[PDB]
Amino acid sequence: LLGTQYISKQEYDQALADAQQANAAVTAAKAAVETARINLAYTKVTSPISGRI
Amino acid sequence: PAVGVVTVKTEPLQITTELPGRTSAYRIAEVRPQVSGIILK
Q: B40 touching A, CB under 8 A?
């Protein structure tokens, strides 16, 4: 509805806030998974050397 | 009695106290990790 009639660019850009703002909230949570994924599959062996245990 | 005798000429005397220094580096600065984790490489 951009350029055409109702959306009244600020009321659009108030939503283009909320997309760009809540996709940023995903980037918070998708990294908050990637934090708590590297406390889940982070068990243990080995430490990243390769050799004889 | 033939007595050899010393007349005291006095003034200069460098006094140096030699004594056991225990040398140490100027900045030791042991690299301690600021942040936990596996040492990757």
A: yes
**Nearest residue on chain A to B40, alpha-carbon basis:** A48
C-beta neighbour count of A12 within 10 angstroms:
13
> How far A35 CA lies from chain B's nearest CA (Å)?
13
Q: How far is CA A41 from CA A17, A27, A36, A38, B33, in A?
A: 35, 20, 9, 6, 23
Resolution in A: 6.5
Q: Is A46 on the interface with B (CB under 8 A)?
A: no
Tokens 């600021």, residue located: B34
Asked if B36 has any chain A CB less than 8 Å from its own CB, the reply is: no
Round to whole Å and give the CA distance between A34 and A37: 5
User: Which DSSP string corresponds to B1-41?
Assistant: -------------------------S-------SS-S----
